[PDB]
C-alpha cells in the first residue's frame, strides 16, 4: 500500500528531467520489420509498435 510513492520519486528524478531526456531521445531506433525478423520478444517490441504479449 506504500510502494506507489516510491515509484512517484523516479518520475521526478528522471522523466521530466532534461539532461536524462537529452541522454535518451531518438537513440537506437530499431523499429522496422527487421525488428521482428530478428525474432525479438517483448520490450524492444511493444514499446516500439506491435501490441502483443503472451
Amino acid at each position: 500500500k506504500n510502494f506507489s510513492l516510491r515509484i512517484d520519486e523516479l518520475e521526478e528524478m528522471l522523466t521530466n528531467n532534461r539532461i536524462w531526456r537529452n541522454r535518451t531521445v531518438d537513440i537506437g531506433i530499431v523499429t522496422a520489420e527487421d525488428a521482428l525478423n530478428y525474432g525479438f520478444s517483448g520490450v524492444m517490441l511493444r514499446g516500439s509498435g506491435i501490441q502483443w504479449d503472451l
Binding site: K1, N2, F3, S4, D8, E11, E12
Partner: protein
C-alpha cells in the same frame, strides 16, 4: 483451518501518477526577474556616482600640495 486471507480490511493503493503543482509560471516569472534587476541598477548610480565625487576629493588633496 489456519489459513490466510482476511474477511475485510483493504485499500487499495493507487496506480495513479500526479504531482503537477504550479508554480508561479507564465508572465509571473520574467516579471519578478526584471523587477529585481532594475532595482539593482537603481541601487547603482547612487553609489558609483557618489564614489566619483569622493574620488575628486582624493585628487584634491594632491593638488593643494605640490608646489
Amino acid at each position: 483451518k489456519q489459513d490466510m486471507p482476511p474477511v475485510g480490511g483493504y485499500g487499495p493503493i493507487d496506480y495513479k501518477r500526479n504531482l503537477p503543482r504550479r508554480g508561479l509560471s507564465g508572465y509571473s516569472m520574467f516579471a519578478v526577474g526584471i523587477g529585481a534587476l532594475l532595482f539593482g541598477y537603481w541601487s547603482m548610480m547612487k553609489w558609483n556616482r557618489e564614489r566619483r565625487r569622493l574620488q575628486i576629493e582624493d585628487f584634491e588633496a594632491r593638488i593643494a600640495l605640490m608646489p
